[PDB]
Amino acid sequence: GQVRQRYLYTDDAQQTEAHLEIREDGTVGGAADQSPESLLQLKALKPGVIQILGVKTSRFLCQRPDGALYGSLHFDPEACSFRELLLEDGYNVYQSEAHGLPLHLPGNKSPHRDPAPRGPARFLPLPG
């Protein structure tokens, strides 16, 4: 079970049903329904650290220092690695261990202001 295939879906989408989707252009965001690009290969690097590679785009989902998500052709553990936080409540979350940057979908910066504080999006992986 070194690597598993699962779809990333969060309860935040409850307001607007959507699943994490990776664009071929390397961009990221939600989708109307479960799209092929929503399928991410969950790979385990080191105990507590994992990697995610989209099957459709064959791009490695990595977060930039700014905290934005984007697919990349090359592998970078400093940004393509995340710490898995498993809650007894049955919720799973991902965060970058490099700088402690939280994982979140892009476009969330709709407000004019940009507060430093930011809560991570709870994700519920679904069987691939």
N, CA, C and O atoms as CSV, one atom per row, in Angstrom:
chain,resi,resn,atom,element,x,y,z
A,1,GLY,N,N,0.860,-1.217,0.000
A,1,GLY,CA,C,0.000,0.000,0.000
A,1,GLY,C,C,0.879,1.244,0.000
A,1,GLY,O,O,0.523,2.265,0.589
A,2,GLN,N,N,2.029,1.154,-0.663
A,2,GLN,CA,C,2.948,2.283,-0.728
A,2,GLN,C,C,2.287,3.455,-1.446
A,2,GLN,O,O,2.455,4.610,-1.053
A,3,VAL,N,N,1.534,3.147,-2.501
A,3,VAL,CA,C,0.829,4.169,-3.273
A,3,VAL,C,C,-0.619,3.751,-3.498
A,3,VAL,O,O,-0.910,2.580,-3.743
A,4,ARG,N,N,-1.523,4.725,-3.411
A,4,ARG,CA,C,-2.954,4.469,-3.596
A,4,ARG,C,C,-3.598,5.565,-4.439
A,4,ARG,O,O,-3.132,6.705,-4.457
A,5,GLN,N,N,-4.676,5.205,-5.138
A,5,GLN,CA,C,-5.396,6.153,-5.989
A,5,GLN,C,C,-6.676,6.616,-5.302
A,5,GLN,O,O,-7.540,5.799,-4.986
A,6,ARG,N,N,-6.802,7.923,-5.068
A,6,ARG,CA,C,-8.006,8.451,-4.421
A,6,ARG,C,C,-8.322,9.870,-4.899
A,6,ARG,O,O,-7.425,10.620,-5.282
A,7,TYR,N,N,-9.610,10.227,-4.870
A,7,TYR,CA,C,-10.042,11.566,-5.274
A,7,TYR,C,C,-10.043,12.477,-4.058
A,7,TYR,O,O,-10.455,12.063,-2.975
A,8,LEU,N,N,-9.587,13.713,-4.222
A,8,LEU,CA,C,-9.567,14.660,-3.103
A,8,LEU,C,C,-10.827,15.527,-3.110
A,8,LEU,O,O,-11.035,16.334,-4.017
A,9,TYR,N,N,-11.663,15.347,-2.086
A,9,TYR,CA,C,-12.901,16.118,-1.952
A,9,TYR,C,C,-13.011,16.658,-0.536
A,9,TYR,O,O,-12.787,15.931,0.432
A,10,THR,N,N,-13.358,17.939,-0.415
A,10,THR,CA,C,-13.484,18.572,0.909
A,10,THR,C,C,-14.931,18.937,1.221
A,10,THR,O,O,-15.748,19.128,0.320
A,11,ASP,N,N,-15.232,19.029,2.517
A,11,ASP,CA,C,-16.581,19.358,2.966
A,11,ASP,C,C,-16.896,20.826,2.710
A,11,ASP,O,O,-18.056,21.235,2.749
A,12,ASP,N,N,-15.860,21.615,2.448
A,12,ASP,CA,C,-16.052,23.031,2.173
A,12,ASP,C,C,-16.907,23.178,0.922
A,12,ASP,O,O,-17.696,24.114,0.791
A,13,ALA,N,N,-16.728,22.233,0.010
A,13,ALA,CA,C,-17.472,22.217,-1.239
A,13,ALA,C,C,-18.956,21.972,-0.981
A,13,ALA,O,O,-19.771,22.080,-1.897
A,14,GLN,N,N,-19.307,21.643,0.257
A,14,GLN,CA,C,-20.706,21.376,0.575
A,14,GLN,C,C,-21.583,22.523,0.080
A,14,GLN,O,O,-22.686,22.295,-0.418
A,15,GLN,N,N,-21.093,23.751,0.215
A,15,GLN,CA,C,-21.845,24.912,-0.254
A,15,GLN,C,C,-21.982,24.843,-1.773
A,15,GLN,O,O,-23.035,25.153,-2.332
A,16,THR,N,N,-20.897,24.430,-2.428
A,16,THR,CA,C,-20.868,24.289,-3.886
A,16,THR,C,C,-20.160,22.989,-4.246
A,16,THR,O,O,-18.936,22.955,-4.374
A,17,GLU,N,N,-20.936,21.921,-4.409
A,17,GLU,CA,C,-20.368,20.612,-4.722
A,17,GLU,C,C,-19.247,20.729,-5.747
A,17,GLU,O,O,-19.449,21.219,-6.859
A,18,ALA,N,N,-18.062,20.270,-5.353
A,18,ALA,CA,C,-16.899,20.316,-6.228
A,18,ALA,C,C,-15.754,19.491,-5.652
A,18,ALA,O,O,-15.667,19.288,-4.441
A,19,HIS,N,N,-14.877,19.017,-6.537
A,19,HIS,CA,C,-13.719,18.216,-6.138
A,19,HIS,C,C,-12.444,18.874,-6.653
A,19,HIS,O,O,-12.474,19.580,-7.661
A,20,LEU,N,N,-11.328,18.647,-5.970
A,20,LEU,CA,C,-10.068,19.238,-6.404
A,20,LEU,C,C,-9.723,18.712,-7.787
A,20,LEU,O,O,-9.724,17.502,-8.015
A,21,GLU,N,N,-9.427,19.622,-8.711
A,21,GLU,CA,C,-9.096,19.238,-10.084
A,21,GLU,C,C,-7.826,19.940,-10.554
A,21,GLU,O,O,-7.642,21.133,-10.314
A,22,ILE,N,N,-6.949,19.189,-11.228
A,22,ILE,CA,C,-5.703,19.759,-11.755
A,22,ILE,C,C,-5.828,19.954,-13.262
A,22,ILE,O,O,-6.148,19.020,-13.996
A,23,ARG,N,N,-5.571,21.175,-13.709
A,23,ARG,CA,C,-5.663,21.502,-15.127
A,23,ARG,C,C,-4.425,21.023,-15.875
A,23,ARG,O,O,-3.358,20.841,-15.288
A,24,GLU,N,N,-4.587,20.823,-17.174
A,24,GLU,CA,C,-3.487,20.385,-18.019
A,24,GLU,C,C,-2.474,21.505,-18.129
A,24,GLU,O,O,-1.284,21.274,-18.343
A,25,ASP,N,N,-2.970,22.725,-17.979
A,25,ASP,CA,C,-2.123,23.901,-18.056
A,25,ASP,C,C,-1.277,24.006,-16.797
A,25,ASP,O,O,-0.372,24.834,-16.707
A,26,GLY,N,N,-1.587,23.151,-15.824
A,26,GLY,CA,C,-0.853,23.136,-14.559
A,26,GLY,C,C,-1.589,23.925,-13.480
A,26,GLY,O,O,-1.137,23.983,-12.336
A,27,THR,N,N,-2.720,24.532,-13.838
A,27,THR,CA,C,-3.491,25.293,-12.858
A,27,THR,C,C,-4.339,24.338,-12.021
A,27,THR,O,O,-4.513,23.175,-12.385
A,28,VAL,N,N,-4.863,24.830,-10.899
A,28,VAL,CA,C,-5.670,23.994,-10.002
A,28,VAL,C,C,-6.970,24.697,-9.634
A,28,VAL,O,O,-7.087,25.916,-9.759
A,29,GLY,N,N,-7.945,23.914,-9.178
A,29,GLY,CA,C,-9.235,24.470,-8.795
A,29,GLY,C,C,-10.282,23.372,-8.656
A,29,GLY,O,O,-9.977,22.189,-8.812
A,30,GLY,N,N,-11.515,23.770,-8.363
A,30,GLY,CA,C,-12.602,22.810,-8.210
A,30,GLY,C,C,-13.228,22.485,-9.561
A,30,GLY,O,O,-12.902,23.109,-10.571
A,31,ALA,N,N,-14.129,21.505,-9.572
A,31,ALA,CA,C,-14.804,21.097,-10.805
A,31,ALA,C,C,-16.274,20.804,-10.531
A,31,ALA,O,O,-16.661,20.544,-9.392
A,32,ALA,N,N,-17.088,20.849,-11.577
A,32,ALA,CA,C,-18.515,20.596,-11.429
A,32,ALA,C,C,-18.767,19.202,-10.868
A,32,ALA,O,O,-19.642,19.012,-10.023
A,33,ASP,N,N,-17.993,18.227,-11.344
A,33,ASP,CA,C,-18.134,16.840,-10.889
A,33,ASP,C,C,-16.772,16.156,-10.835
A,33,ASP,O,O,-15.752,16.762,-11.165
A,34,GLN,N,N,-16.762,14.895,-10.416
A,34,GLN,CA,C,-15.514,14.144,-10.342
A,34,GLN,C,C,-14.923,13.997,-11.739
A,34,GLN,O,O,-15.417,13.214,-12.550
A,35,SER,N,N,-13.863,14.754,-12.014
A,35,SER,CA,C,-13.216,14.717,-13.326
A,35,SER,C,C,-11.964,13.827,-13.276
A,35,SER,O,O,-11.427,13.610,-12.190
A,36,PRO,N,N,-11.491,13.314,-14.395
A,36,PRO,CA,C,-10.270,12.446,-14.407
A,36,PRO,C,C,-9.077,13.121,-13.725
A,36,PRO,O,O,-8.270,12.463,-13.069
A,37,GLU,N,N,-8.977,14.435,-13.889
A,37,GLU,CA,C,-7.863,15.189,-13.308
A,37,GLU,C,C,-8.004,15.305,-11.787
A,37,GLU,O,O,-7.085,15.775,-11.116
A,38,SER,N,N,-9.144,14.882,-11.243
A,38,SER,CA,C,-9.340,14.940,-9.800
A,38,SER,C,C,-8.685,13.730,-9.149
A,38,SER,O,O,-8.556,13.657,-7.927
A,39,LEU,N,N,-8.275,12.782,-9.987
A,39,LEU,CA,C,-7.625,11.569,-9.514
A,39,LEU,C,C,-6.151,11.859,-9.244
A,39,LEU,O,O,-5.411,12.239,-10.152
A,40,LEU,N,N,-5.730,11.679,-7.995
A,40,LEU,CA,C,-4.341,11.939,-7.615
A,40,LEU,C,C,-3.704,10.697,-7.008
A,40,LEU,O,O,-4.261,10.086,-6.097
A,41,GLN,N,N,-2.535,10.329,-7.519
A,41,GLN,CA,C,-1.827,9.167,-6.988
A,41,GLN,C,C,-1.194,9.535,-5.659
A,41,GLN,O,O,-0.225,10.294,-5.620
A,42,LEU,N,N,-1.733,9.005,-4.571
A,42,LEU,CA,C,-1.181,9.293,-3.261
A,42,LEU,C,C,0.022,8.400,-3.030
A,42,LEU,O,O,-0.111,7.185,-2.880
A,43,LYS,N,N,1.203,9.014,-3.001
A,43,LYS,CA,C,2.449,8.275,-2.810
A,43,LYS,C,C,3.102,8.630,-1.483
A,43,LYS,O,O,3.126,9.792,-1.079
A,44,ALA,N,N,3.629,7.613,-0.812
A,44,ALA,CA,C,4.288,7.811,0.480
A,44,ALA,C,C,5.798,7.941,0.305
A,44,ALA,O,O,6.443,7.047,-0.244
A,45,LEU,N,N,6.362,9.056,0.774
A,45,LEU,CA,C,7.808,9.269,0.673
A,45,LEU,C,C,8.484,8.744,1.930
A,45,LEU,O,O,9.217,7.756,1.904
A,46,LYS,N,N,8.214,9.437,3.032
A,46,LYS,CA,C,8.760,9.089,4.341
A,46,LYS,C,C,7.612,9.041,5.344
A,46,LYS,O,O,6.621,9.745,5.149
A,47,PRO,N,N,7.698,8.256,6.389
A,47,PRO,CA,C,6.600,8.193,7.386
A,47,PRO,C,C,6.145,9.604,7.774
A,47,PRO,O,O,6.894,10.360,8.392
A,48,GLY,N,N,4.910,9.946,7.403
A,48,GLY,CA,C,4.350,11.263,7.714
A,48,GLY,C,C,4.389,12.201,6.505
A,48,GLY,O,O,3.684,13.209,6.482
A,49,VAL,N,N,5.211,11.872,5.502
A,49,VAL,CA,C,5.330,12.707,4.299
A,49,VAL,C,C,4.877,11.934,3.065
A,49,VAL,O,O,5.237,10.771,2.884
A,50,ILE,N,N,4.083,12.593,2.216
A,50,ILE,CA,C,3.556,11.962,1.005
A,50,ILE,C,C,3.697,12.877,-0.214
A,50,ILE,O,O,4.008,14.061,-0.090
A,51,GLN,N,N,3.460,12.296,-1.393
A,51,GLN,CA,C,3.523,13.023,-2.667
A,51,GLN,C,C,2.246,12.739,-3.454
A,51,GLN,O,O,1.635,11.683,-3.292
A,52,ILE,N,N,1.845,13.682,-4.304
A,52,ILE,CA,C,0.629,13.521,-5.107
A,52,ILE,C,C,0.911,13.818,-6.577
A,52,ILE,O,O,1.392,14.896,-6.929
A,53,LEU,N,N,0.602,12.839,-7.426
A,53,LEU,CA,C,0.827,12.946,-8.871
A,53,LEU,C,C,-0.470,12.633,-9.624
A,53,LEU,O,O,-1.006,11.530,-9.521
A,54,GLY,N,N,-0.966,13.614,-10.378
A,54,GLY,CA,C,-2.197,13.439,-11.149
A,54,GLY,C,C,-1.978,12.466,-12.303
A,54,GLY,O,O,-0.989,12.571,-13.028
A,55,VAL,N,N,-2.898,11.521,-12.471
A,55,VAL,CA,C,-2.767,10.532,-13.532
A,55,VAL,C,C,-3.059,11.120,-14.914
A,55,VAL,O,O,-2.330,10.858,-15.871
A,56,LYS,N,N,-4.120,11.911,-15.013
A,56,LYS,CA,C,-4.509,12.502,-16.293
A,56,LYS,C,C,-3.470,13.482,-16.828
A,56,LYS,O,O,-3.086,13.408,-17.996
A,57,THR,N,N,-3.016,14.396,-15.979
A,57,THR,CA,C,-2.044,15.405,-16.403
A,57,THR,C,C,-0.612,14.927,-16.207
A,57,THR,O,O,0.316,15.491,-16.787
A,58,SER,N,N,-0.428,13.895,-15.395
A,58,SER,CA,C,0.915,13.392,-15.142
A,58,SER,C,C,1.768,14.501,-14.537
A,58,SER,O,O,2.992,14.501,-14.668
A,59,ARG,N,N,1.102,15.448,-13.871
A,59,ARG,CA,C,1.779,16.572,-13.234
A,59,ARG,C,C,1.847,16.365,-11.732
A,59,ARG,O,O,0.927,15.812,-11.129
A,60,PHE,N,N,2.941,16.812,-11.133
A,60,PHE,CA,C,3.112,16.689,-9.694
A,60,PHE,C,C,2.538,17.929,-9.021
A,60,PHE,O,O,3.009,19.042,-9.252
A,61,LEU,N,N,1.521,17.733,-8.189
A,61,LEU,CA,C,0.888,18.856,-7.511
A,61,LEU,C,C,1.821,19.388,-6.431
A,61,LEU,O,O,2.086,18.711,-5.438
A,62,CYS,N,N,2.314,20.607,-6.632
A,62,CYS,CA,C,3.223,21.233,-5.675
A,62,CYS,C,C,2.753,22.642,-5.353
A,62,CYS,O,O,2.150,23.309,-6.193
A,63,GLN,N,N,3.031,23.095,-4.129
A,63,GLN,CA,C,2.619,24.430,-3.696
A,63,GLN,C,C,3.807,25.383,-3.675
A,63,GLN,O,O,4.866,25.063,-3.135
A,64,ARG,N,N,3.616,26.556,-4.269
A,64,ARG,CA,C,4.669,27.558,-4.322
A,64,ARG,C,C,4.815,28.233,-2.952
A,64,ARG,O,O,3.888,28.152,-2.146
A,65,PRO,N,N,5.926,28.887,-2.660
A,65,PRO,CA,C,6.102,29.562,-1.340
A,65,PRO,C,C,4.942,30.507,-1.025
A,65,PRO,O,O,4.581,30.687,0.138
A,66,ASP,N,N,4.361,31.107,-2.062
A,66,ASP,CA,C,3.247,32.022,-1.857
A,66,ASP,C,C,2.045,31.261,-1.309
A,66,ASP,O,O,1.156,31.848,-0.693
A,67,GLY,N,N,2.025,29.945,-1.540
A,67,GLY,CA,C,0.936,29.100,-1.041
A,67,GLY,C,C,-0.044,28.698,-2.143
A,67,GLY,O,O,-1.097,28.131,-1.851
A,68,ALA,N,N,0.287,28.983,-3.403
A,68,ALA,CA,C,-0.610,28.618,-4.507
A,68,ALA,C,C,-0.302,27.206,-5.003
A,68,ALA,O,O,0.850,26.771,-4.997
A,69,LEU,N,N,-1.345,26.501,-5.431
A,69,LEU,CA,C,-1.208,25.128,-5.929
A,69,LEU,C,C,-1.084,25.107,-7.453
A,69,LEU,O,O,-1.804,25.820,-8.152
A,70,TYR,N,N,-0.166,24.285,-7.960
A,70,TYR,CA,C,0.035,24.175,-9.403
A,70,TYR,C,C,0.698,22.842,-9.756
A,70,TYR,O,O,1.525,22.335,-8.998
A,71,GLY,N,N,0.332,22.281,-10.906
A,71,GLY,CA,C,0.923,21.022,-11.353
A,71,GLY,C,C,2.292,21.278,-11.977
A,71,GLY,O,O,2.479,22.271,-12.680
A,72,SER,N,N,3.250,20.384,-11.722
A,72,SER,CA,C,4.604,20.544,-12.264
A,72,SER,C,C,5.088,19.262,-12.928
A,72,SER,O,O,4.792,18.159,-12.470
A,73,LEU,N,N,5.837,19.426,-14.013
A,73,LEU,CA,C,6.376,18.291,-14.754
A,73,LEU,C,C,7.458,17.580,-13.945
A,73,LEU,O,O,7.560,16.353,-13.968
A,74,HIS,N,N,8.263,18.363,-13.231
A,74,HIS,CA,C,9.363,17.815,-12.439
A,74,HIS,C,C,8.950,17.627,-10.985
A,74,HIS,O,O,7.968,18.209,-10.525
A,75,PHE,N,N,9.715,16.806,-10.270
A,75,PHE,CA,C,9.436,16.523,-8.864
A,75,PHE,C,C,10.275,17.419,-7.952
A,75,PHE,O,O,11.477,17.585,-8.159
A,76,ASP,N,N,9.621,17.991,-6.944
A,76,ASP,CA,C,10.288,18.868,-5.979
A,76,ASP,C,C,9.756,18.552,-4.573
A,76,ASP,O,O,8.642,18.971,-4.258
A,77,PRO,N,N,10.480,17.848,-3.730
A,77,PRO,CA,C,9.950,17.490,-2.381
A,77,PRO,C,C,9.741,18.704,-1.473
A,77,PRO,O,O,8.868,18.689,-0.606
A,78,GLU,N,N,10.535,19.745,-1.670
A,78,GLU,CA,C,10.413,20.940,-0.840
A,78,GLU,C,C,9.032,21.577,-0.990
A,78,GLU,O,O,8.572,22.283,-0.092
A,79,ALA,N,N,8.373,21.330,-2.123
A,79,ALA,CA,C,7.043,21.901,-2.377
A,79,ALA,C,C,6.021,20.812,-2.707
A,79,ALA,O,O,4.828,20.978,-2.452
A,80,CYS,N,N,6.492,19.702,-3.272
A,80,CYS,CA,C,5.601,18.605,-3.650
A,80,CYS,C,C,5.395,17.621,-2.498
A,80,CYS,O,O,4.777,16.572,-2.679
A,81,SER,N,N,5.912,17.960,-1.316
A,81,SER,CA,C,5.761,17.100,-0.139
A,81,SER,C,C,4.808,17.748,0.852
A,81,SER,O,O,4.780,18.972,0.984
A,82,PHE,N,N,4.026,16.929,1.550
A,82,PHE,CA,C,3.066,17.443,2.519
A,82,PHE,C,C,2.952,16.521,3.722
A,82,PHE,O,O,3.108,15.306,3.605
A,83,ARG,N,N,2.680,17.111,4.881
A,83,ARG,CA,C,2.509,16.340,6.101
A,83,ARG,C,C,1.036,15.969,6.231
A,83,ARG,O,O,0.164,16.829,6.102
A,84,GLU,N,N,0.758,14.696,6.485
A,84,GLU,CA,C,-0.627,14.237,6.586
A,84,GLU,C,C,-1.149,14.321,8.018
A,84,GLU,O,O,-0.643,13.651,8.918
A,85,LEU,N,N,-2.170,15.157,8.212
A,85,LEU,CA,C,-2.788,15.321,9.525
A,85,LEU,C,C,-4.093,14.542,9.560
A,85,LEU,O,O,-5.080,14.945,8.944
A,86,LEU,N,N,-4.096,13.427,10.280
A,86,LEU,CA,C,-5.296,12.596,10.378
A,86,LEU,C,C,-6.010,12.883,11.698
A,86,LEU,O,O,-5.427,12.748,12.774
A,87,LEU,N,N,-7.275,13.279,11.600
A,87,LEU,CA,C,-8.073,13.599,12.781
A,87,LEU,C,C,-8.933,12.411,13.193
A,87,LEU,O,O,-9.458,11.686,12.348
A,88,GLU,N,N,-9.067,12.221,14.500
A,88,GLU,CA,C,-9.869,11.124,15.023
A,88,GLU,C,C,-11.296,11.301,14.550
A,88,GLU,O,O,-12.068,10.346,14.457
A,89,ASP,N,N,-11.627,12.547,14.255
A,89,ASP,CA,C,-12.952,12.885,13.774
A,89,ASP,C,C,-13.171,12.256,12.405
A,89,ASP,O,O,-14.280,12.268,11.870
A,90,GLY,N,N,-12.092,11.704,11.845
A,90,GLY,CA,C,-12.159,11.044,10.543
A,90,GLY,C,C,-11.876,12.007,9.391
A,90,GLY,O,O,-12.274,11.748,8.255
A,91,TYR,N,N,-11.193,13.117,9.679
A,91,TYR,CA,C,-10.857,14.098,8.636
A,91,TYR,C,C,-9.359,14.075,8.348
A,91,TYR,O,O,-8.544,13.920,9.257
A,92,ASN,N,N,-9.005,14.232,7.071
A,92,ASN,CA,C,-7.602,14.220,6.647
A,92,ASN,C,C,-7.230,15.569,6.032
A,92,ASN,O,O,-8.038,16.178,5.331
A,93,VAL,N,N,-6.007,16.034,6.293
A,93,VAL,CA,C,-5.549,17.319,5.752
A,93,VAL,C,C,-4.088,17.235,5.320
A,93,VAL,O,O,-3.347,16.363,5.774
A,94,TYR,N,N,-3.682,18.151,4.440
A,94,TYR,CA,C,-2.304,18.181,3.939
A,94,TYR,C,C,-1.702,19.577,4.084
A,94,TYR,O,O,-2.371,20.582,3.843
A,95,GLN,N,N,-0.432,19.622,4.480
A,95,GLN,CA,C,0.277,20.887,4.669
A,95,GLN,C,C,1.754,20.716,4.313
A,95,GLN,O,O,2.341,19.666,4.574
A,96,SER,N,N,2.350,21.746,3.719
A,96,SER,CA,C,3.758,21.674,3.335
A,96,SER,C,C,4.650,21.706,4.571
A,96,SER,O,O,4.474,22.550,5.450
A,97,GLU,N,N,5.607,20.785,4.633
A,97,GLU,CA,C,6.523,20.717,5.767
A,97,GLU,C,C,7.720,21.644,5.570
A,97,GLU,O,O,8.410,21.994,6.527
A,98,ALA,N,N,7.958,22.035,4.325
A,98,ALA,CA,C,9.090,22.899,4.005
A,98,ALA,C,C,9.022,24.224,4.767
A,98,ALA,O,O,9.995,24.624,5.406
A,99,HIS,N,N,7.875,24.903,4.701
A,99,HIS,CA,C,7.707,26.189,5.382
A,99,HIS,C,C,6.419,26.225,6.208
A,99,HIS,O,O,6.070,27.262,6.770
A,100,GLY,N,N,5.719,25.100,6.279
A,100,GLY,CA,C,4.482,25.045,7.050
A,100,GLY,C,C,3.344,25.749,6.318
A,100,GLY,O,O,2.398,26.226,6.945
A,101,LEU,N,N,3.436,25.813,4.993
A,101,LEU,CA,C,2.395,26.460,4.199
A,101,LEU,C,C,1.179,25.527,4.094
A,101,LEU,O,O,1.346,24.371,3.705
A,102,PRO,N,N,-0.017,25.980,4.420
A,102,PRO,CA,C,-1.231,25.114,4.348
A,102,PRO,C,C,-1.685,24.885,2.908
A,102,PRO,O,O,-1.482,25.738,2.043
A,103,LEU,N,N,-2.300,23.731,2.658
A,103,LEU,CA,C,-2.783,23.405,1.316
A,103,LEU,C,C,-4.216,23.895,1.143
A,103,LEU,O,O,-5.093,23.577,1.946
A,104,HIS,N,N,-4.444,24.674,0.087
A,104,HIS,CA,C,-5.775,25.211,-0.190
A,104,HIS,C,C,-5.938,25.474,-1.683
A,104,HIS,O,O,-4.956,25.673,-2.397
A,105,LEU,N,N,-7.183,25.473,-2.149
A,105,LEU,CA,C,-7.454,25.702,-3.564
A,105,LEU,C,C,-7.227,27.175,-3.934
A,105,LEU,O,O,-7.477,28.054,-3.109
A,106,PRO,N,N,-6.766,27.455,-5.136
A,106,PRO,CA,C,-6.521,28.856,-5.599
A,106,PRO,C,C,-7.824,29.602,-5.881
A,106,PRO,O,O,-8.849,28.989,-6.179
A,107,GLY,N,N,-7.771,30.930,-5.783
A,107,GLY,CA,C,-8.950,31.764,-6.019
A,107,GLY,C,C,-9.634,32.097,-4.701
A,107,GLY,O,O,-10.606,32.851,-4.663
A,108,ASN,N,N,-9.112,31.524,-3.623
A,108,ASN,CA,C,-9.661,31.753,-2.293
A,108,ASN,C,C,-9.369,33.179,-1.830
A,108,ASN,O,O,-9.968,33.664,-0.871
A,109,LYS,N,N,-8.446,33.843,-2.521
A,109,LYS,CA,C,-8.074,35.214,-2.175
A,109,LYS,C,C,-8.997,36.210,-2.869
A,109,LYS,O,O,-8.536,37.170,-3.487
A,110,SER,N,N,-10.302,35.975,-2.762
A,110,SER,CA,C,-11.282,36.856,-3.386
A,110,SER,C,C,-11.353,38.210,-2.671
A,110,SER,O,O,-11.510,39.239,-3.328
A,111,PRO,N,N,-11.243,38.228,-1.363
A,111,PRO,CA,C,-11.301,39.495,-0.574
A,111,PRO,C,C,-10.177,40.459,-0.960
A,111,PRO,O,O,-9.087,40.033,-1.342
A,112,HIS,N,N,-10.451,41.755,-0.856
A,112,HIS,CA,C,-9.453,42.763,-1.192
A,112,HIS,C,C,-8.258,42.651,-0.251
A,112,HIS,O,O,-7.107,42.741,-0.678
A,113,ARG,N,N,-8.545,42.452,1.033
A,113,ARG,CA,C,-7.494,42.318,2.033
A,113,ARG,C,C,-6.890,40.920,1.981
A,113,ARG,O,O,-7.509,39.987,1.468
A,114,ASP,N,N,-5.676,40.778,2.515
A,114,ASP,CA,C,-4.990,39.483,2.533
A,114,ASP,C,C,-4.416,39.201,3.920
A,114,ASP,O,O,-3.211,39.342,4.128
A,115,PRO,N,N,-5.247,38.813,4.851
A,115,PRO,CA,C,-4.807,38.503,6.245
A,115,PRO,C,C,-3.789,37.362,6.268
A,115,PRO,O,O,-3.888,36.418,5.483
A,116,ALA,N,N,-2.815,37.453,7.167
A,116,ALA,CA,C,-1.794,36.419,7.264
A,116,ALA,C,C,-2.419,35.101,7.728
A,116,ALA,O,O,-2.127,34.049,7.158
A,117,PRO,N,N,-3.258,35.143,8.731
A,117,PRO,CA,C,-3.934,33.918,9.254
A,117,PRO,C,C,-4.794,33.249,8.181
A,117,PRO,O,O,-5.482,33.926,7.417
A,118,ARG,N,N,-4.748,31.924,8.129
A,118,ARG,CA,C,-5.528,31.180,7.145
A,118,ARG,C,C,-5.717,29.739,7.604
A,118,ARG,O,O,-4.745,29.051,7.918
A,119,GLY,N,N,-6.965,29.281,7.644
A,119,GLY,CA,C,-7.249,27.912,8.067
A,119,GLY,C,C,-7.196,26.958,6.867
A,119,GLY,O,O,-7.648,27.325,5.782
A,120,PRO,N,N,-6.665,25.767,7.031
A,120,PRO,CA,C,-6.579,24.769,5.921
A,120,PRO,C,C,-7.936,24.143,5.600
A,120,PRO,O,O,-8.819,24.081,6.455
A,121,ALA,N,N,-8.089,23.683,4.362
A,121,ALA,CA,C,-9.336,23.056,3.934
A,121,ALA,C,C,-9.327,21.576,4.298
A,121,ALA,O,O,-8.388,20.855,3.961
A,122,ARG,N,N,-10.372,21.125,4.987
A,122,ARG,CA,C,-10.459,19.722,5.365
A,122,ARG,C,C,-10.758,18.894,4.125
A,122,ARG,O,O,-11.698,19.191,3.388
A,123,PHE,N,N,-9.958,17.851,3.891
A,123,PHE,CA,C,-10.143,16.991,2.719
A,123,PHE,C,C,-10.571,15.584,3.127
A,123,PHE,O,O,-10.132,15.043,4.142
A,124,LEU,N,N,-11.441,15.016,2.300
A,124,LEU,CA,C,-11.969,13.674,2.498
A,124,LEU,C,C,-11.636,12.825,1.265
A,124,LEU,O,O,-12.422,12.796,0.318
A,125,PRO,N,N,-10.513,12.146,1.256
A,125,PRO,CA,C,-10.118,11.301,0.092
A,125,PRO,C,C,-11.148,10.205,-0.198
A,125,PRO,O,O,-11.647,9.554,0.720
A,126,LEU,N,N,-11.461,10.008,-1.485
A,126,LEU,CA,C,-12.434,8.985,-1.899
A,126,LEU,C,C,-11.701,7.867,-2.654
A,126,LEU,O,O,-10.739,8.164,-3.363
A,127,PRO,N,N,-12.103,6.619,-2.535
A,127,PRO,CA,C,-11.415,5.520,-3.272
A,127,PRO,C,C,-11.294,5.834,-4.767
A,127,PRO,O,O,-12.276,6.205,-5.410
A,128,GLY,N,N,-10.089,5.684,-5.310
A,128,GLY,CA,C,-9.865,5.950,-6.728
A,128,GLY,C,C,-10.714,5.024,-7.590
A,128,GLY,O,O,-10.660,5.101,-8.818
